[PDB]
Amino acid sequence: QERVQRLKEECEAGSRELKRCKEENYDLAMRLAHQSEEKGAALMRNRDLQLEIDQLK
Amino acid sequence: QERVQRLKEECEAGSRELKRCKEENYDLAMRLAHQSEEKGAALMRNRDLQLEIDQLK
Numbered sequence A, B: 001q002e003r004v005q006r007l008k009e010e011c012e013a014g015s016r017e018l019k020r021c022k023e024e025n026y027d028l029a030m031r032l033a034h035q036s037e038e039k040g041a042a043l044m045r046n047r048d049l050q051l052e053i054d055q056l057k
């Protein structure tokens, strides 16, 4: 009777929330990849800086 | 009656997947915060290393 209606409305609301949750997940994964690249770059800029310091010792 | 239980079961399975999705999102946010702190730590170390280079010029 009415239980089909609330259930379909609940499934629509949950499905909508699941779609935006997966979009957030994709964005967080992309942001995590960007920070790993930026971290990797900063560490290697310090490997270069360190090696150059060691030679002028 | 058959449709009602099918809708009860797909909303329950979808809700379970949404809870699992939010837990993934929390883990990606924690990892993103970790990499951002490690990047900041490398940029700060870079400043002090650059100072050391400037003194041996």
Ligand SMILES: CNC(=O)[C@@H](C1CCCCC1)n1c(-c2cn(Cc3ccccc3)nc2-c2ccccc2)nc2cc(Cl)c(C(=O)O)cc21
Pocket (backbone or CB within 6 Å): A008, A010, A011, A012, A013, A014, A015, A016, A018, A019, A020, A022, B010, B011, B012, B013, B014, B015, B017, B018
């Ligand atoms: C065929 N059904 C599905 O694919 C289900 C999922 C399959 C079984 C495990 C979890 C659900 N689904 C649905 C979905 C499909 N109803 C059936 C339905 C019935 C009437 C109206 C609207 C939806 N229910 C849901 C639902 C319900 C509650 C919370 C989250 C999702 N929306 C999705 C959005 C997304 Cl973003 C995704 C995804 O990318 O994986 C999947 C979703």
